[PDB]
Amino acid sequence: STGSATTTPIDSLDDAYITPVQIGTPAQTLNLDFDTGSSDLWVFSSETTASEVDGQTIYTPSKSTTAKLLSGATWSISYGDGSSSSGDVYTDTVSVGGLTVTGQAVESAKKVSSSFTEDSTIDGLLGLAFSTLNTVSPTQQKTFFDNAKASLDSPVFTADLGYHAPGTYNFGFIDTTAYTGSITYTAVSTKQGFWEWTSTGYAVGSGTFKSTSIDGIADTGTTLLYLPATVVSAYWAQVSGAKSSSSVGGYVFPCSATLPSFTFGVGSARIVIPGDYIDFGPISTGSSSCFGGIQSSAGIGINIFGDVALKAAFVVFNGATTPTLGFASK
């Protein structure tokens, strides 16, 4: 089997991407944030505290003939941005782009934090990291990808995120028309439950490439590119008027400045992030200070190749017995 679904930016900045997912019978279609940095499929639901729902589409398990309470199971998750959610669990039929999993754990939110309530466009998350991070207790549950894996033509999924445009998540096959050149594969460590890999270095604009190992995670659920402070400082030093603002919470730059590209290494290959991808617009409406798309990972505890980086590539998440990551230009 395979599946193929279009993923669409939630706003003009590509702050996140939503992908339609069919849950239950008859289908209830919710727009979920596919997140390769977490491992819970959770949804706004008929059980979510009413005051915490503001415009989202909800899953109503009582209207699904295939929903079954996963008795006794609860879940509770906190994300790197400080957001959180929790609730109980149903199993139900879940389909993504034509690919169907029966008995998928669908984690029904009883509570969500304010960041989720305030984002009307995201009806929940679909985790695509390793199932060892799944938060269901007492019985940890498998991700949609892990459940689908044995049925897939090939045990892979791919992320092809657009810059200010829709893209595609494919399951079970590699679309050879979707990238240029070759796919360079690189080793993954699953020790922390993430798609964790080691970039071979970076370049700023037309500068010389610096060979240096940068361990980080491929995370479709994080907007920006978070790298060590040394790397980030070297980037922003090439932008006229750029500075790190403690009041704003990162690097900002005058909207009049030109942004250089940023290149990251994948083995001997190179992925070039165009300068435009690093522009996240005014810090507040009408401001001449623009927020940067490359920020320091210091104090996160991990480097994160978020959407800014991933959308510059065609990315293969290879879930073979020994997982790997592939990157191609496109």
From Swiss-Prot:
Residues 17-328 form the Peptidase A1 domain. The lineage of its organism: Eukaryota, Fungi, Dikarya, Ascomycota, Pezizomycotina. The keyword Oxidoreductase does not apply. One of its GO terms (molecular function) is aspartic-type endopeptidase activity. Belongs to the peptidase A1 family. It comes from the Eukaryota. The gene is EAPA. The keyword Signal applies. This is Endothiapepsin. GO terms for biological process: proteolysis. Its EC number is 3.4.23.22. Disulfide bonds join 255-290. Keywords: Aspartyl protease, Disulfide bond, Hydrolase, Protease, Signal, Zymogen. The active site is at 35, 199. It catalyses: Hydrolysis of proteins with specificity similar to that of pepsin A, prefers hydrophobic residues at P1 and P1', but does not cleave 14-Ala-|-Leu-15 in the B chain of insulin or Z-Glu-Tyr. Clots milk. It is an enzyme of class 3 (hydrolase).
